[PDB]
Design a protein around this ligand. Structure first.
Ligand SMILES: OCc1cn(-c2ccc(Cl)c(C(F)(F)F)c2Cl)nn1
Ligand SMILES: *[C@@H]1O[C@H](CO)[C@@H](O)[C@H](O)[C@H]1NC(C)=O
Length: 355
């Protein structure tokens, strides 16, 4: 459909297996708005777990089998009916093929079976798009879901710094992090981290950064310092260090959070209290995030789904909140930007995704 594949002209910037990374683009000739969306999909943090991902999730590690087009959906749709927010924007979908939460800066070599180049992929996509119209942009919104949402937090200020150093200080860089705001909390039941899905969130990231040669935003790196940069993968810790405006979308009971917490859904008191405390902790971390949308749902659904318009918090949808955010970056009467549910159990918001 609407978005056409371009493999990176710089073939040194590669997916895990050394195949070229790339991006899907649909231009909107009149528009000075650019949406660059980072795909998600977990990660892998050692040879054995990356080898397994290569066998059964190869599109997340290689471009060799990518289709020449993709259909833009949700926030990437060009139909105003599906995307009330930014339907006329230039649309870019950046496939996630680095398995590194978009943090890596390491090539495949004689010492490395895999390349982890997520941070360099973003930089190279931006560089190559400048010749295709991005040089004329007024706003570059770097968005992403799941691992791509965390990728927004890790990379939005680097994109801003890149554009400034390349001589484009007028492009306003902003971030939209969907489902990438995690807690480094205690698991409901202990597991010994061997697989990526149920590994505790803290140890997963500590192993990953070393394997990927992962990079984090400079101000956050200066706070936590050497050996402790894993802290910067956690939204509530990295967000206060960022300078670009960032809108945070996060379900209060995110399914990936529950997975790494070893929760698998009648609920008895201990698990009831665990889940309720998780939602309260998430809500607490968003108290001082002025642009946020945090519904009280158990979900893995993301902003590129076609029915993303349906969820509301306090009667405001996400496309409306994002429009209000745009207005705020020029409070607004009846145009809120901070929308965090206060009810304490999944689906206490009636507009939660049905499943
Ligand atoms: O597609 C699901 C998914 C989730 N994530 C992820 C990204 C960053 C972080 Cl810091 C974490 C966490 F919680 F473990 F720490 C996770 Cl689960 N990546 N992909
Ligand atoms: C290709 O990408 C690498 C890694 O980001 C970079 O060092 C190099 O300068 C790039 N080459 C060109 C011609 O842009």
């Amino acid at each position: 459909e609407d978005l056409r594949l371009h493999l990176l002209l710089n073939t040194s910037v590669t997916c895990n297996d050394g195949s070229p990374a790339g991006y899907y683009l649909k231009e909107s000739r009149g528009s000075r708005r650019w949406l660059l969306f980072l795909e998600g999909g977990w990660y892998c943090f050692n040879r054995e777990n990356c080898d397994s991902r290569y066998d059964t999730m190869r599109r997340l590690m290689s471009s060799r089998d990518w289709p020449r087009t993709r259909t833009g959906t949700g926030i990437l749709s060009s139909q105003p009916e599906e995307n009330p927010y930014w339907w006329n924007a230039n649309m870019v979908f950046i496939p996630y093929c680095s398995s590194d939460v978009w943090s890596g800066a390491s090539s495949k070599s004689e010492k490395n079976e895999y390349a982890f180049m997520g941070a360099l992929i973003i930089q190279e996509v931006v560089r190559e798009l400048l010749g295709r119209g991005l040089s004329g942009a007024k706003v570059l919104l770097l968005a992403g879901s799941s691992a791509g949402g965390t990728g927004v937090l890790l990379n939005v200020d680097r994109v801003a710094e890149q554009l400034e150093k390349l001589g484009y200080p007028a492009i306003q860089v902003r971030g939209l992090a969907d489902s990438g705001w995690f807690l480094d909390n205690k698991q409901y039941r202990h597991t010994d981290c061997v697989d990526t899905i149920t590994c505790a969130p803290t140890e997963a990231i500590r192993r990953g950064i070393r394997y990927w040669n992962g990079v984090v935003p400079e101000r956050c790196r200066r706070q936590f310092q050497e050996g402790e940069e894993w802290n910067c993968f956690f939204g509530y810790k990295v967000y206060p260090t960022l300078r670009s405006p960032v809108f945070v979308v996060q379900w209060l009971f995110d399914e990936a959070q529950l997975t790494v917490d070893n929760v698998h859904l009648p609920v008895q008191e201990g698990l009831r209290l665990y889940i309720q405390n998780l939602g309260r902790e998430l809500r607490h971390t968003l108290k001082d995030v002025p642009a946020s949308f945090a519904p009280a749902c158990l979900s893995h659904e993301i902003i590129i789904r076609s029915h993303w318009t349906d969820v509301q918090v306090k009667g405001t949808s996400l496309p409306r909140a994002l429009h209000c955010w745009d207005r705020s970056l020029h409070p607004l009467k009846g145009c809120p930007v901070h929308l965090v549910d206060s009810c304490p159990w999944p689906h206490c918001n009636p507009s939660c995704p049905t499943g």
